[PDB]
Amino acid sequence: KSAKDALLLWCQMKTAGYPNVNIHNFTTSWRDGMAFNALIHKHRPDLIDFDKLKKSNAHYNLQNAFNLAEQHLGLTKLLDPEDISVDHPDEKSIITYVVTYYHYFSKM
Length: 108
Prior knowledge:
The chain has 108 residues and is mainly alpha-helical. It has one domain: Actin-binding Protein, T-fimbrin, domain 1 (Orthogonal Bundle). It is built from five helices and no strands. Helix 1 packs across helix 5 and helix 2 packs parallel to helix 3. The longest helix is centred in the middle third of the chain and has 16 residues. It is classed as actin-binding.
């Protein structure tokens, strides 16, 4: 629990002030893809025109973050957009992938 709470807080603090990002959990807060894009943008703003993204386009947003993180950051695409854009995606799968972002952006 302390580790999960710490990871949640890390995500909230990195994405503070991003419009249309509201991270309160490791499931529905992630299903529209905006939060993944905000985490990448905070560290690599060269990779995303965040202002262009809209919550309604879950598949586009998810694929955008997953593909950019694979191609430019070397982070394997553990998640499929179709699995994540459901109403109630799986917490463990999302945490495993977010931990890869946390380790990458927190080291180097």
